């Protein structure tokens, strides 16, 4: 059971994005697309760093996007996290 | 002469490289024959000597011939390994060092960690004139020269790679030289690159398979002084046979965990031994003579030996090999001691080994 | 950040592409410090946010303890959790990790002998092996090989590899000697 | 042929009970666990034989005084004075013993080769009784899976 | 086998609707789409 649990964690992390949940098949239409998406676009470390930046930045000094995210975070509303959508899927017509 | 010897040398090298595996497998068969003959080796009565029992009398000359044959085949196997698999190792090492020089600057921008034997030994081959002797890319020196020549200094890079400084300029320009012939021993000495062969010999001596074959040769030699050293050649079944590797991988897949389980068992038995030494000592008399006891838990070390050896090998635990605790003040305590020992050590700790092997299979 | 935003929102503009190569060094210097996430903006569209990541934050994130915490968190959310609490658990883990790395940053303010012995053994033993050739006394074996014979050639062929094997044995003995001298 | 031989000796009809494997199909599921890794089960026995041969070589060369299997002081029952006899002893009694070869030989306490004998017995128990007999269990369970 | 059976039940219930049988991939084009579909649209408790 422990072996299967570790294998399941590995398989999920390798075949599904942690944030948006889109599988690697969609992202791997451009070479290394899944790696680019999971290390540059939807990096959970990047989200943690953004939370740190938003907390340490003064409230009056936020931009509008930062203020939007800050208000959602203060209300504990997680609709600003992309779920099933991404930049590539949104602008697939324009990007490609 | 100087060409015929090279031709015959190449013929022998090709033969041994071709038949490396055949002699490698023949050595195992000869070892099995020797060890089967050894099963009829009695001891006869001080200065005692071992005698080879035989009704036919053909057993001893056959054993001597088989031992000599095994030694010869082991030597031939080392020669075949050197002819066949050493060039691949040299090629891989040369490719690795060349690519670390080019795409990592291993000896220009950085340096080895001073505790990596491979990195420190590879310093010798960079300056050699016979570099990529096996690697195809003959332009690695020029490539590193172009890459790191400007910023790190052209002369410094040339000295690091052991390239010519000014003779090439004059040779593209005008110069004159005198010929030589292969028959000149001085010419052969100049042709031979001492430093590159030094590095090659170091790499071969560091190779893990050449060392194993050398150990095989060493025990084959020792088998002539003592015929029972040929038994160590039956450990070669794991390497020679590939189907036995599937079975043996179950043990070695969780190899570190199997060692850590034994360590945990040792710690648990040490705790039980501490408890016994502090509370249950009268129960560890292992003698039937009423006059003289055989107290096996009057010393910490002795009680630990007893628990690790007899208690662990016992099928019911330490309680199968000590005095019965009935009718004693510490009766329930001894019962709990024995039951917990049986459950944790005999049942649980010995089940983790089974589970590790089965999980390796799966 | 401005250049990255322009490039990533104008992915096929040749003028901007040729303008970016004039800022490669700046963009390479600021690459580790340039944050980039994606959010579902107030205009009901996926938007990309660019922020700053501090060197201290990155160094504390790359610490082994934080890596172990992240691994355990990922294991827990993949196995024992669902999507319906995924982002809440992720935010909680982010908060705990942020506090831990801030505390770590504020509290943190500003064998080789065996390898050398083995290398020396290799050098010494190989030099001793090569000294038969570096002795320049090959005249004796030349006079032996004047009466060239297949037996003599095969004997020399076997003797070279026997000498190699003896050199390896001497090297192994020297390794044992060096190890035993170092431990004692 | 065995049905005919059963008339001369009525106990040859016992060999017809080996027909349960063929006649019954539900017993085939149980018997396939043994026969699925059939070659590996034979190779495991071969490896066990080799390991016990190595242990027997070690005993014959170093531990011979410990293999007296007689209570009569006058006449010994030396079971490791011959290579073949010591190998029979190790393969039969030592393997079938629940603690290894150390359960059936003389106690090594108070001897020059005491720690050596302890290591011998413990390694035999671990490698043969515990590990080599665990590979069979693992092979059967893996065949089931 | 019992562990695998329970895991299979969990996987089927998490990746496929009980009533219509459409996978969660189609429904998860709107955030929390599968949960909305399986708890408001095709709820087996609602059918009962
Ligand atoms: N949102 C995400 N953020 C980061 N990685 C993701 C994400 N979604 C999927 N992944 C994938 O999960 C993998 C797991 O990365 P993880 O952090 O465990 O290891 P790593 O970066 O290779 O290094 P290490 O664990 O040694 O620090 C990533 O390499 C990536 O391919
Ligand atoms: N037709 C369906 N009706 C209900 N749930 C469905 C349906 N199809 C798929 N599901 C999924 O199966 C899951 C199993 O729900 P289940 O009734 O077992 O547990 P629960 O609602 O979380 O609570 P509990 O079991 O503690 O009462 C649901 O949460 C839902 O995501
Ligand atoms: Zn994503
Ligand atoms: Zn439905």
Instruction: Give the DSSP letter string of B299-356.
Output: SHHHHHHHIIIIIHHSSS-GGGSS---TTSTTHHHHHHHHHHHIIIIIIIIHHHHHHH
Pocket of ligand 2 (CB under 6 A): E 13, 17-19, 35, 38, 42-44
Phi-psi sector, B50: left (phi>0), alpha (psi -120 to 50), beta: beta
Closest CA to B233 of B89, B69, B344: B69
CB B185 within 8 A of CB B120: no
Q: Are E and B touching by the rule of 3+ CB pairs within 8 Å? A: no
Closest CA to B234 of D83, D128, D63, D51: D51
Is the Cβ pair A53, C95 closer than 8 Å? no
Which residue does chain C place closest to B76, by CA atoms? C158
- Which chain C residues are within 8 Å of E11, Cβ to Cβ? none
Closest CA to C32 of C6, C62, C12: C62
Which ligand is located closest to the Cα atom of residue E39? 2
A9, A80, A87: residue with CB nearest C74:
A9
d(CA A4, CA A12): 12
Q: Are A and E touching by the rule of 3+ CB pairs within 8 Å? A: yes
Interface test with B, best of D79, D138, D141, D142 (most B CBs within 10 A): D138
* Backbone dihedral angles phi then psi of residue B90, each to the nearest 5 degrees: -65, -40
Which ligand is located closest to the Cα atom of residue C82? 2
d(CA B255, CA B249): 9
3 state SS of C35: strand
Q: Which two tokens stand for residue C119?
A: 């290398």
Q: Are B and C touching by the rule of 3+ CB pairs within 8 Å? A: yes
What is the H or E stretch that residue C100 is in? helix C86-107
Cα D104–Cα D108–Cα D111 angle in degrees, nearest 5: 155
Closest CA to B120 of C118, C58, C153: C118
Give distance in angstroms: CA of C49 to centre of ligand 1.
20
A9, A42, A79: residue with CB nearest C38:
A42
CB C90 within 8 A of CB A44: yes
Closest CA to C122 of B120, A64, B314, D29: B120
Within 13 Å of residue D8, how many CA atoms lie on the same side as its CB?
4
* Cα maximum dimension of chain D: 64
Q: For residue B25, give every residue at least 6 positions away whose Cβ sits within 8 Å of its Cβ, in sequence order, or none.
A: B240
Q: What is the dihedral sign for C-alpha A26, A28, A29, A35?
A: positive
Residue with tokens 């009525």: D10
Cα C92–Cα C94–Cα C99 angle in degrees, nearest 5: 100
3 state SS of D109: coil
d(CA B52, CA C89): 76
Q: What is the dihedral sign for C-alpha D115, D118, D122, D123?
A: positive
How was this model experimentally determined? cryo-EM
- Which chain C residues are within 8 Å of B201, Cβ to Cβ? 126, 129, 164, 167
β-pair partners for A23: A16
Q: For residue B328, give every residue at least 6 positions away whose Cβ sits within 8 Å of its Cβ, in sequence order, or none.
A: B334
The b/e string for D5-36 (b: 16+ C-beta within 10 A; e otherwise) is: eeeeeeeeeeeeeeeeeeeeeeeeeeeeeeee
Phi-psi sector, C117: left (phi>0), alpha (psi -120 to 50), beta: alpha
Best residue for ligand 2 mutational test, from E15, E39, E43, E46 (most atoms within 8 Å of Cβ): E39
Could you tell me the CA-to-CA distances from D68 to D54, D104, D125 in Å, in that order?
20, 10, 20
Is the Cβ pair D81, B42 closer than 8 Å? yes
A51, A83, A90: residue with CB nearest C45:
A90
Could you tell me the CA-to-CA distances from B110 to B92, B113, B152, C116 in Å, in that order?
21, 9, 12, 20
What is the H or E stretch that residue C34 is in? strand C34-40
Q: For residue D105, give every residue at least 6 positions away whose Cβ sits within 8 Å of its Cβ, in sequence order, or none.
A: D63, D66, D67
β-pairing, B49-52 with C34-40?
unpaired
Q: Which two tokens stand for residue B194?
A: 């001492």
Residue with tokens 């850590």: B260
CB B125 within 8 A of CB B97: yes
The b/e string for B128-151 (b: 16+ C-beta within 10 A; e otherwise) is: beebbbbbeeeebbeebbebbbee
Closest CA to B241 of D39, D62, A91: D39
Q: For residue A20, which atom of ligand 1 is closest to its CA?
A: 1
* Nearest Cα residue to atom 12 of ligand 2: E13
Breaks (C-N over 2.5 A) in chain C follow: 110
* Nearest Cα residue to atom 5 of ligand 1: A38
Residue with tokens 């004692």: C184
Closest CA to C164 of B62, D66, B211, B248: B211
* Backbone dihedral angles phi then psi of residue B4, each to the nearest 5 degrees: -65, -40
The alpha carbon torsion through E2, E5, E11, E16 (nearest 10 deg) reads -150
Could you tell me the CA-to-CA distances from B38 to B141, B219, B235, B301, C130 in Å, in that order?
58, 16, 16, 40, 41
Give distance in angstroms: CA of E1 to centre of ligand 4.
28
Q: Is B259 on the interface with D (CB under 8 A)?
A: no
CB B205 within 8 A of CB C122: yes
β-pair partners for E23: E16
Neighbours of B267 (CB within 10 A): 10
- Which chain C residues are within 8 Å of E32, Cβ to Cβ? 83-84
Cβ(A24) to ligand 1 under 6 A?
Answer: no
Closest CA to D59 of D51, D67, D71: D67
CB B320 within 8 A of CB B342: no
Q: Which two tokens stand for residue E32?
A: 């929390």
Neighbours of C16 (CB within 10 A): 14
CB A28 within 8 A of CB A34: yes
d(CA D46, CA B92): 37
* Backbone dihedral angles phi then psi of residue D68, each to the nearest 5 degrees: -85, 120
* Backbone dihedral angles phi then psi of residue C104, each to the nearest 5 degrees: -65, -40
Give distance in angstroms: CA of B249 to centre of ligand 1.
30
Neighbours of E3 (CB within 10 A): 9
d(CA C13, CA C5): 13
The separation between CA D133 and the C-alpha centre of its own chain, rounded to angstroms, equals 9
Q: What is the dihedral sign for C-alpha B61, B63, B68, B73?
A: positive
Which residue does chain E place closest to A85, by CA atoms? E29
- Which chain B residues are within 8 Å of D145, Cβ to Cβ? 362
d(CA B207, CA B227): 28
d(CA B248, CA B238): 8
* Backbone dihedral angles phi then psi of residue C42, each to the nearest 5 degrees: -70, -20
**Between chain C and chain E, how many beta carbons pairs sit less than 8 Å apart?**
4
Q: For residue E27, give every residue at least 6 positions away whose Cβ sits within 8 Å of its Cβ, in sequence order, or none.
A: E17, E33, E34, E36, E37
Give distance in angstroms: CA of A43 to centre of ligand 1.
8
Is the Cβ pair B205, C122 closer than 8 Å? yes
CB A6 within 8 A of CB A69: no
Q: For residue B117, give every residue at least 6 positions away whose Cβ sits within 8 Å of its Cβ, in sequence order, or none.
A: B206, C115, C118, C119
DSSP string, B128-181: -TTTTSSSS-TTHHHHHHHHHHHHH-HHHHHHHHT--SSHHHHHHS--------
CB C175 within 8 A of CB C117: yes
Q: Is B259 on the interface with C (CB under 8 A)?
A: no
Neighbours of E36 (CB within 10 A): 13
Residue with tokens 């031992």: B67
DSSP string, A14-83: HHB-SSS--BHHHHTTSTTHHHHIIIIIS-HHHHHHHHHHHHHS-GGG--HHHHHHHHHHHTT--TTS-S
Burial class of residue D120, CB neighbours in 10 A (0-12, 13-18, 19+): buried
Q: For residue D80, give every residue at least 6 positions away whose Cβ sits within 8 Å of its Cβ, in sequence order, or none.
A: D56, D59, D60, D63, D64, D66, D67, D86, D89
Interface test with C, best of B15, B201, B212 (most C CBs within 10 A): B201
* Cα maximum dimension of chain A: 51
Closest CA to B15 of B83, B108, B103: B83
Which residue does chain E place closest to A81, by CA atoms? E31
Cβ(A88) to ligand 1 under 6 A?
Answer: no
* Nearest Cα residue to atom 18 of ligand 1: C71
Cα D72–Cα D77–Cα D81 angle in degrees, nearest 5: 150
Residue with tokens 């089940």: B351
d(CA B133, CA B129): 9
CB B265 within 8 A of CB B312: yes
B185, B192, B214: residue with CB nearest C165:
B214
d(CA C177, CA C120): 12
- Which chain D residues are within 8 Å of B251, Cβ to Cβ? 131, 135
β-pairing, C46-52 with C34-40?
antiparallel
* Nearest Cα residue to atom 30 of ligand 2: E38
CB B334 within 8 A of CB B280: yes
Phi-psi sector, A23: left (phi>0), alpha (psi -120 to 50), beta: beta
Q: What is the dihedral sign for C-alpha B301, B307, B310, B312?
A: negative
* Backbone dihedral angles phi then psi of residue B52, each to the nearest 5 degrees: -90, 105
d(CA B132, CA B97): 10
Residues in chain B: 362
- Which chain C residues are within 8 Å of A8, Cβ to Cβ? 78-79
Cβ(A42) to ligand 1 under 6 A?
Answer: yes
Alpha-carbon gap: A85 to the closest alpha carbon of chain C (Å): 7
3 state SS of D5: helix
Closest CA to B71 of B27, B12, B132, B7: B27
DSSP string, B45-104: ----EEEE--SSS-HHHHHHHHHHHHHHHHHHHHHHHHHHTHHHHHHHHHHHHHHHHHHH
Q: What is the dihedral sign for C-alpha B32, B37, B39, B42?
A: negative
């Amino acid at each position: 059971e422990l072996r299967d649990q570790q294998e399941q964690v590995k398989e999920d992390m390798e075949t599904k994005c942690f944030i948006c949940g889109i599988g690697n098949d969609y992202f791997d239409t451009v070479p290394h697309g899944f790696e680019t998406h999971t290390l540059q676009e939807h990096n959970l470390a990047n989200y943690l760093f953004f939370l740190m930046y938003l907390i340490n930045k003064d409230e009056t000094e936020h931009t509008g996007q930062e203020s939007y995210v800050w208000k959602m975070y203060q209300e504990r509303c997680w609709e600003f996290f992309p779920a099933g959508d991404c930049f590539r899927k949104q602008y697939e017509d324009q990007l490609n | 002469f100087w060409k015929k010897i090279i031709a015959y040398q190449q013929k022998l090298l090709n033969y041994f490289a071709r038949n490396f595996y055949n002699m490698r497998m023949l050595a195992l068969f000869v070892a099995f024959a020797i060890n089967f003959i050894l099963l009829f080796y009695k001891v006869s009565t001080i200065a005692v000597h071992y005698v080879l029992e035989e009704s036919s009398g053909y057993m001893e000359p056959t054993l001597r011939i088989l031992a000599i044959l095994h030694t010869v085949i082991s030597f031939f196997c080392i020669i075949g390994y050197y002819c066949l698999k050493v060039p691949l190792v040299i090629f891989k090492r040369e490719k690795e060092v060349a690519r670390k020089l080019e795409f990592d600057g291993l000896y220009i921008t950085e340096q080895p960690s001073e505790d990596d034997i491979k990195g420190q030994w590879d310093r010798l081959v960079i300056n050699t004139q016979s570099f990529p002797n096996n690697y195809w890319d003959k332009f690695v020196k020029r490539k590193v020269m172009d890459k790191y020549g400007e910023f790190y200094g052209r002369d410094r890079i040339s000295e690091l790679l052991g390239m010519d400084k000014a003779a090439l300029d004059f040779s593209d320009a005008r110069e004159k030289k005198k010929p030589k012939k292969d028959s000149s021993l001085s010419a052969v000495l100049n042709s031979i690159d001492v430093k590159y062969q030094m590095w090659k010999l170091g790499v071969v001596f560091t190779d893990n398979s050449f060392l194993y074959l050398a150990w095989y040769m060493t025990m084959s030699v020792l088998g002539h002084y003592n015929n029972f050293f040929f038994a160590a050649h039956l450990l070669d079944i794991a390497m020679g046979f590939k189907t036995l590797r599937t079975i043996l991988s179950s043990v070695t897949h969780n190899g570190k965990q199997l060692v850590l389980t034994v360590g945990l068992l040792a710690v648990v038995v040490y705790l039980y031994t501490v408890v016994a030494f502090n509370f249950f000592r009268k129960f560890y008399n292992k003698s039937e003579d009423g006059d003289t006891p055989d107290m096996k838990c009057d010393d910490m070390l002795t009680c630990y030996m007893f628990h690790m050896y007899v208690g662990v090998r016992a099928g019911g635990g330490i309680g199968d090999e000590i005095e019965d605790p009935a009718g004693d003040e510490y009766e329930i305590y001894r019962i709990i001691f024995d039951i917990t020992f049986f459950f944790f050590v005999i049942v649980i700790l010995l089940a983790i080994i089974q589970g590790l092997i089965i999980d390796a299979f799966g | 950040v401005l250049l990255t935003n322009l490039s990533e929102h104008m992915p096929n503009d040749t003028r901007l592409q040729t303008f970016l190569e004039l800022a490669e060094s700046v963009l390479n210097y600021f690459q580790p410090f340039l944050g980039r996430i994606e959010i579902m903006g107030s205009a009901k569209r996926i938007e990309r946010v660019y922020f700053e990541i501090s060197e201290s934050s990155r160094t504390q994130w790359e610490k082994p303890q934080v890596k172990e915490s992240k691994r355990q968190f990922i294991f827990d959310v993949v196995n024992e959790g669902g999507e319906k609490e995924k982002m809440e658990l992720f935010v909680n883990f982010c908060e705990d990790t942020i506090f831990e790395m801030q505390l770590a940053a504020q509290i943190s303010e500003s064998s080789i002998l065996t390898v050398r012995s083995a290398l020396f053994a290799l050098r010494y033993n190989i030099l001793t092996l090569m000294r038969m050739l570096s002795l320049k006394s090959l005249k004796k074996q030349m006079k032996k090989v004047k009466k060239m014979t297949v037996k003599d050639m095969v004997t020399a062929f076997f003797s070279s590899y026997w000498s190699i094997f003896m050199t390896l044995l001497h090297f192994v003995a020297s390794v044992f000697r060096g190890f035993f001298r170092i431990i004692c």
